[PDB]
Amino acid sequence: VLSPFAPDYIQRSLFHRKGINEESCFSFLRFIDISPAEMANLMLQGLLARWLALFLSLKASYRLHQLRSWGAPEGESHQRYLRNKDFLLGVNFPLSFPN
Amino acid sequence: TQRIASHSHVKGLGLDESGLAKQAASGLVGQENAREACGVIVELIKSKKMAGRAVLLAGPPGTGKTALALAIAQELGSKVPFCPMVGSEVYSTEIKKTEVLMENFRRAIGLRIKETKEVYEGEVTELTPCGKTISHVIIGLKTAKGTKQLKLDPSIFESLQKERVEAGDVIYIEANSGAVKRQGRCDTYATEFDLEAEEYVPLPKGDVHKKKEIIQDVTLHDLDVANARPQGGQDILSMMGQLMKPKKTEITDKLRGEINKVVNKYIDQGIAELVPGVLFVDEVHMLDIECFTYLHRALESSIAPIVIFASNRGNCVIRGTEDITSPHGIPLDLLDRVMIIRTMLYTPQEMKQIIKIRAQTEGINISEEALNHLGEIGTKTTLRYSVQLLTPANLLAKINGKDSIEKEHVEEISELFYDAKSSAKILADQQDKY
Amino acid sequence: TQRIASHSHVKGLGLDESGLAKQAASGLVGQENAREACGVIVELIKSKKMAGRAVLLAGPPGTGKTALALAIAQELGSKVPFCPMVGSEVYSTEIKKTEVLMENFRRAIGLRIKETKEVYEGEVTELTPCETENPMGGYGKTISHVIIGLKTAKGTKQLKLDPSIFESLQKERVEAGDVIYIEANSGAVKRQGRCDTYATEFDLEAEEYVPLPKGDVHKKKEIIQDVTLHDLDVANARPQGGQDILSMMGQLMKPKKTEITDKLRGEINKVVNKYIDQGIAELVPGVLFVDEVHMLDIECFTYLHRALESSIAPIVIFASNRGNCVIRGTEDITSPHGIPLDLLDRVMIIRTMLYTPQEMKQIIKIRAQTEGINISEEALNHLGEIGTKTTLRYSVQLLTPANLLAKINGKDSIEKEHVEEISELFYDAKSSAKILADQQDKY
Amino acid sequence: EGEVTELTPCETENKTISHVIIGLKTAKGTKQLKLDPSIFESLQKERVEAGDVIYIEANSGAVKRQGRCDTYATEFDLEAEEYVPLPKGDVHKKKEIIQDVTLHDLDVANARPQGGQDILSMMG
Amino acid sequence: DVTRIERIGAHSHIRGLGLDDALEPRQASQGMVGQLAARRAAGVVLEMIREGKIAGRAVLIAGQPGTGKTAIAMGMAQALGPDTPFTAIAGSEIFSLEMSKTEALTQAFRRSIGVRIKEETEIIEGEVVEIQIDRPSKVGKLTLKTTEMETIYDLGTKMIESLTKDKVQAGDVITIDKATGKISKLGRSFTRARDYDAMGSQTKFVQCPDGELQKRKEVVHTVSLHEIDVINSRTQGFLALFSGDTGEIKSEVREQINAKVAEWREEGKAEIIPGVLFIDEVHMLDIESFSFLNRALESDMAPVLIMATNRGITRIRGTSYQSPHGIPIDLLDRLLIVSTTPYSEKDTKQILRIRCEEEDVEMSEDAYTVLTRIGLETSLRYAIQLITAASLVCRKRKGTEVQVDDIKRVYSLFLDESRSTQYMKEYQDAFLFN
Amino acid sequence: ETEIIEGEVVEIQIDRPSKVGKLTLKTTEMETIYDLGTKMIESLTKDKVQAGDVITIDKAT
Amino acid sequence: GEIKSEVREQINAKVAEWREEGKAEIIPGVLFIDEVHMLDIESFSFLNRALESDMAPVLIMATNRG
Amino acid sequence: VASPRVTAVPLDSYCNDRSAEYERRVLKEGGSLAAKQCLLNGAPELAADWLNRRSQFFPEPAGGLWSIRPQNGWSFIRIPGKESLITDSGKLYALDVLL
Ligand SMILES: Nc1ncnc2c1ncn2[C@@H]1O[C@H](COP(=O)(O)OP(=O)(O)O)[C@@H](O)[C@H]1O
Ligand SMILES: Nc1ncnc2c1ncn2[C@@H]1O[C@H](COP(=O)(O)OP(=O)(O)O)[C@@H](O)[C@H]1O
């Protein structure tokens, strides 16, 4: 109950701030594909949920690679607001497995 | 019964209401100044205002500095967490030196939660689950004191199905914790099968539902450990959790700040309250100069709990410097922040009083002449020697058939056991043969 | 914009056509001998005729040998790789020093491989199981080929594929309008996701909506990917594919630098030799840089002999700001510059000298124009007196607070009262060192 | 040991396999035996199929596969599996094996569970 | 009466650093008195931090022990404002058995560089009234309630498969994202979960959400550079982020990070915020670290450095040399040194008057002469402890205000380090390892 | 010392109910027809072999 | 790393059996060591006794100083 | 060819109640079902995908011990065979070379 990952605490702390500019943890998780409740379920659930999340993360790396290698340039209105999965550079390497 | 402990005789500092130190109280005699100062520190801890304060006990070996520290531990009560630490335990292979110290700082502070334990236990007569899934599960409970019925959710019903709960099984369920335990099948069903693998217990006496009040205290270190790394202790039945071996790892500052933030919300809601503990440190002179450098910022932190330092040595070379020496084996930087308390050796009369207190604590009757002779030996060599001579004298007394200690018996033991000074002097003559 | 870096004002060596070093070029003044020597070094790098060459840079602190070494990479460009490494990174808990130096030697050299790609992408208009008519008594029904339609903004195209791929299309979820990735060379079929056009029918849906690809249905493009021999050594070191349980669990384990055997190095050299013989892959040498070389262990100093005697060793440059010092690892052994005589005989030493006060004023002016700060004449003279009294570095550091305080006071230019107040508040290293002597008893 | 003519798992209600039924064909005779689900897990671990010669021991519980019989080599002109001849002798044979082992080898065997029929023993 | 996780501390009595438009330090500002040139240069370098036009700058502060190096450092940090990356680490914190010192200092330079990004999202978060599905493609709807409004959602087949796969039931507060498609279960309602007699092992109570059910808004997220390194190094970067298990990171991934962040800066999407890295007691540090700080300062990007040295001349560990501030001469010129001055006996009375407001314990004007005499003749922190320890004795006397006899009493209870050394010289022969 | 088969594939046939199929190969000297087993079909289908490709198959390996 | 010695002994015996069978042949090899003077004396004491093995190949060392 | 001399079975705990026998039989036999199939086939959906892939013409690669095979066998038992019988006598090797 006192664990730092509470889905309500990630929603309230992530989407609720006392000021316009404030540093709140887990803000990177919004850029990651991982859901706030998926992170708490992965932490408290066990290693098996992490294994399944990785087994899905491989196919997510495939699809992310097929989307990454084309579809450019992006418009400026799309430059004003970033898109999910932008944080992951793991497939951006030239020697990455999908490439 | 309980095994006799060396410090078990000390019940506290033994101070009056005015703060003055009585001559004999709480199993302590002498050291009135150190006892009074330690009492002012006790009230300082009970004030719950200042933090990061450090104390220092400076005295020769055998002056009872540890007895004063544990006297503070007994004076504060069982509510405040008290963490003893040895200077030799800071060094570890898996976890770094500074993370050990920070781990102890997080171990001193603790929280207090008040909850009402509701015990639902007894024989389960029926299991009646009621786009289908499970809306709710009807479960009966029957004991010799009465019968009650409860409706439960598919989660705890899933716990019961994992526990293989069937009709006729006595179970134990806590409402707050939500855990499910299976004691066994009812004794009435034991007569149908001549051989059955399931154990049988009689119908538990007492109410099906018991309301109690439990106040649990949980330190911050356990919370930071469970939340530091993935727990993996959800299901022991999993084969994957047995593969990886656990080990200690250093904790990031981000998680520590997160815990510090999430504690404030609960202590603001009032579900829990904070009880800052006391961090006791023995052999502080043995800590590394890097450990002292970390103690500078650690003591300068605003959330640091009160720390007490025990150093039994005089001027020594600082650990890791190999050249420069400093008083009390501590550098001047850390030594200037702490408050030093002076301690002195006991007089012969106080020695006799200590030997008497330890005698009546151990429960052994000693003669007055044996007490005077033991005090004389304590003045000749050390107090620890005469204190340790108490048991063997009673042993030889029981061997000779006497229930009391005599001066001839303790005088016979004094020749059987050698003091450190006498042995050290004997080693000089035979040192060539050694 | 880009944050201003201390060396960011050095854009290269600024060599002439005849090989001589111009006095002021690329923000570098003085050190004609060093700039010309490095001017020959870059000719060795471009020539690629020799390997294992070790250059040494010696001189007092603040002479700009680091600015020249970093100017080498700027003069060479982005074609050849450049790997600066300090000697402090050689000491590591997990990875041994020899493996660090070896992995750096593999980090310097790099490869470039040109490859063509053919990809079919777009929205699926129709999927048909084209049935030819060939009734036979042995087996009743026959299917010749499967037709897969694809729609894009530039045009639509239909494809005739063998029925064997329809087994995978039926093996994984495929719906009308699903944007999919299909490569002709690999032959594999992947599902990108649902098209954005159908997202308006449902208020909530689990499937994410990827937009339809803009372009031709058949995209064939040639891209040249640059991969260093170190990257090849890591990819050959650990398997990237996670199909195996040991690869999945090992992927879950924390990655740690592992010692790589020489056999893998030899195999990489062999396959690289094969691709060079084919001419498809282009090999370029790297430039290894080392700073604070006096901090290396004697074991590293002796290891650099066998490391440099190899033909695969890229060109290495050294920077030493120390004079005669005790060799680390040995108490009583003293050697000039802090390097043993064995490696010191192999390396090519380059001497550097301190700047004159005039060159100090010129460098101060260059840094002022770089940071966008204006300096008055007299204040520049007094600042040159300060730098000559102590050091050039301190006089360079005095520029920022006089600029900020000048803007606060409202004067767009620095004045002698501004540098006088700044010089009064801040203390130089030598002055502070002299002050520490009087109060040293209290410290 | 010998040729495996038929192998079928039994089905019992909890779809779990309670017992295993495997016949053994040899030049001396044919005898049907029953095996445990663990031995069946070792067989499926060894990819045992009908028509192959396997080696089974009792006290150790381990399962080995010798290979496919040579009689079936004629049906395929090209095959990856190598063929071994049909062994001779009785199916069940008790034999004495004198082995020399060191107390350090025993100490490592008891120290770590490297060998065994457990999936955790396979992961280790 | 409620006590937060934060308590009074040595540096906790000051909040903010007072300055003016002319950068003229006030005599008493926010509880800080003295150090005119130190506070002024602190304002200059502080405005420099706010500008952030340049990188790779190091500032060393020099002065006698007790001149308030950490006081002016914390004052500058608090005056810089919140949401600014700040990392203050001790010299001994970089030492780790699992991680190399180069990785410790490297991550120390990486973590202090923040990046502020802007991202617009749409989220639907509310309490589920009902759930209904029909399977012939299954079509179903769910009823949600908020304080402002209640509305229903018609969801597709696979969207039903997600909720049914998660065993979602009516009466739970959940959050649904249309773009991503994931479902996040926050908990259950109080009144709905009250019907169950017992609750499962994992459950929580969340209040009914207020406001718009489906909110489409733009949010500015502040991220740190240290987080991306672990996420791009391993498949799971948060597990090793909070666990601190990651170590020995390859530099190529860091170079790719700097390249991609440079690409983001070229796109103008996110702007980087400079940060502060503070190192205290740098006099003891590894010469390898001193050699790494050269390229650390010469790097393209790097946070501002603020370091404190408490010793004038000290031999560096690992070698035998005599150098100012225990640091090499090659790195000595890369630092901007700010000298400090000891506090005057007149200012001691003023800062003590400021410290009286922290404990809210009034002191007579005659007590500031004795307490200032002790803070002058001896260390100031000893007197700072004398007032706090004297207030307790005053409350034991049940007086409304402290007296000189309180400072005399506590002065008799606690002794200075010099005095403890004087007695340690008399009893030093009895102490061990004299 | 190993005996390998090297030639150009004429045709590939597979029957799935164990899967049994045939492989017809052509060389300039002689044209051959061989039968494929279960493991052989699993190996070829794992290697994505279709008619018209020159392949090398090892009998023992 | 730290391979057990019993496995190495069994490998040596099995390789000897292979040489007796003639299916595999054993050929000598050269081990070059440069600047051996910096090697620890423990590796020298282990090298003197370890060189007495039958499978120990001939080795060549170089010494710069004296 | 080299193999360990002795192999030992992991230890087990013996308790005086039935529930610990339940946890012992579950721990020893299947552990978790999805974890057991997830280790054997590498994923549960790879186990169902293997059962459904048995009837498929082109099967995918496995995810686990089904994909990994030893050189000889998981058991270390070995039969000398007819290969080592020829080297026992020099007349058999000479006749084989003469034949
Ligand atoms: N005031 C006291 N009254 C009675 N006994 C005391 C007192 N002070 C010390 N002792 C004796 O000293 C012993 C503990 O000494 P200890 O604290 O271990 O010495 P040190 O602190 O030098 O290690 C106890 O057994 C206790 O009997
Ligand atoms: N000739 C020069 N012209 C302009 N700036 C210089 C010159 N030499 C050195 N500098 C400046 O001095 C700073 C520090 O140089 P440094 O790396 O200490 O030189 P060295 O490595 O020779 O001691 C660099 O940031 C560089 O910008």
Ligand SMILES: Nc1ncnc2c1ncn2[C@@H]1O[C@H](COP(=O)(O)OP(=O)(O)O)[C@@H](O)[C@H]1O
């Ligand atoms: N100018 C000041 N105004 C108020 N308090 C100060 C000042 N300077 C120092 N202090 C106080 O003195 C205490 C000890 O400072 P300390 O950390 O010893 O300084 P230093 O690090 O320079 O030795 C701090 O808790 C701080 O609150």
